[PDB]
Amino acid sequence: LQPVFTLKLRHKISPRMVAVGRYDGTHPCLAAATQAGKVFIHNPDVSLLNINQTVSCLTAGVLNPELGYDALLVGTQTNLLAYDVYNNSDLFYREVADGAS
Amino acid sequence: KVYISLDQPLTALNLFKQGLDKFPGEVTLLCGIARIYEEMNNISSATEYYKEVLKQDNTHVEA
Amino acid sequence: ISILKDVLSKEATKRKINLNISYEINEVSVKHTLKLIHPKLEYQLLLAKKVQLIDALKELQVHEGNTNFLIPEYRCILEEADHLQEEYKKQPAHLERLYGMITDLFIDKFKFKGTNVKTKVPLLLEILDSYDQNALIAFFDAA
Amino acid sequence: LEEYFELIDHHFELRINGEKLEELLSERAVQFRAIQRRLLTRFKDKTPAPLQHLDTLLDGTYKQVIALADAVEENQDNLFQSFTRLKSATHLVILLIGL
């Protein structure tokens, strides 16, 4: 085999904090954590998001099947942030106070 | 006010609409929606919600 | 010389030969070995103090971009970060080897001078942790 | 016109030194601000996190800021004295040109 595509990204990815999903509904994108408590989104350039907190678990998926877009769940060690991206709004913001490992 | 401090205008619009679902005609909620739509520079909806405030108050200085 | 003396005497007593051993020690030789050891300790400590800062420096470049706010005395550290990390992976082994070597050199110098210095052996450890070259040589030649 | 120009050149050298020091202080202040904002974001987070690297960068940047501030003060005073001597020089030069 052979890599069908290969893109070098300008940031250092965190080990287990990588997810992919359609955030516009009809456009898959790659979400990935980064040092300094940030998260970048590769759309096809790169869009940054300020968590200001050391991520410990990231994931994309359908949180409400009414619509189709994928929520972006950025679990901090002391938080949890579902976050619609096509609109700069969040689906919720809870504090678990135990952790998001 | 908090959701606007975090720079999330659409969360604030949804919260205002949920409030207007609880309080079906509150002028403060409608005027908040209008202020948001006018800060997003969408006068087409700011004026519609100010017109709703008018249909409710008719002495509103802001509207 | 010390290791040779120990092992050769041990073998001779393994065969009961009763050999005689004499030695002649130059006073500049220990200072020469110290001048040889010095650059390695200096390099290791410098690498340690660089890896102390590489982390915060990356933490800042992630935000600012590191072309407009940081003085290049740290931009160099940024460019060499990978080497600094991979060599700090081995830095502590070099530190422990060098410290044991300097300790044994002290012991054997003063053993050929005649006395045992096992009491003051830990007393030089904190000197090495400070590591002024001239103060180290003064420690060697004085006490 | 030859012992006059020396005072003008001295004055302009002091001015250029002051501008250079002001740019250096601008850079030091920007760096201090960036590091201080990093420390602030660290203070906002609830979870512990090692930061001694950051505050020992802040201390160095701050001592450099203090040094540069004192240097700018010194250059301002030197420039003022140079200006007061140049005033007398140009007084005398105008007097001589009028005579």
Describe this structure in words.
It is classed as protein transport. The entry lists the keywords Cilia, ciliopathy, complex, membrane-protein transport, protein transport. The entry is titled "Structure of the bovine BBSome complex". Chain A: Bardet-Biedl syndrome 2 protein homolog. The structure is cut from a larger assembly and holds chains A (101 residues), B (63 residues), C (143 residues) and D (99 residues). Chain A is built from no helices and 6 strands. Chain A is mostly beta strands. In chain A, the strands form 2 sheets. A 4-stranded antiparallel sheet of chain A has the order 1-2-3-4, with no helix packed on it. Chain A has a two-stranded antiparallel ribbon with strand order 5-6. In chain A, strand 1 and strand 2 (28-34) form a beta hairpin. The radius of gyration of chain A is 14 Å and the shape is globular. Chain C has one domain (26-143). Chain C is elongated and about 75 Å long. The interface between A and D is small, with 6 and 6 residues.
Short characterization:
This is part of a larger assembly, with chains A (101 residues), B (63 residues), C (143 residues) and D (99 residues). Chain A has 101 residues and is mostly beta strands. Chain A is built from no helices and 6 strands.
Features:
part of a larger assembly, 4 chains, C: 143 residues, mainly alpha, 6 helices, 76% helix, 0% strand, elongated, D: 99 residues, 2 helices, rod-shaped
Q: What's the arrangement of secondary structure elements?
A:
The structure is cut from a larger assembly and holds chains A (101 residues), B (63 residues), C (143 residues) and D (99 residues).
Chain A (H helix, E strand, L loop, with lengths): L12 E10 L5 E7 L3 E5 L3 E5 L4 E7 L9 E6 L25
Antiparallel strand pairs in A: 1-2, 2-3, 3-4, 5-6
Chain B lengths: L1 H4 L3 H14 L4 H13 L3 H14 L7
Helix pairs in contact in B: 2-3, 3-4
Chain C lengths: L1 H14 L11 H38 L7 H17 L2 H23 L11 H6 L2 H10 L1
Helix pairs in contact in C: 2-3, 2-4
Protein name (chain B): Tetratricopeptide repeat domain 8
Organism (chain B): Bos taurus
Protein name (chain C): Bardet-Biedl syndrome 7 protein homolog
Provide the number of structural domains of chain C.
1
Strand content of chain C: under 5%
User: How many individual β-strands of chain C?
Assistant: 0
Structure summary, number of beta strands of chain B: 0
Span between N and C termini of chain C? 22 Å
Counting helices, strands and paired strands, the structural category of chain B is mainly alpha
C-alpha Rg of chain B (nearest Å): 11 Å
Main sheet properties of chain B: none
Number of helices of chain B: 4
The number of helical segments of chain C is: 6
Alpha carbon gyration radius of chain C: 22 Å
What oligomeric state is this? part of a larger assembly
Structural class of chain C: mainly alpha
What amount of the residues of chain B lies in strands?
A: under 5%
Describe the largest sheet of chain C. Answer: none
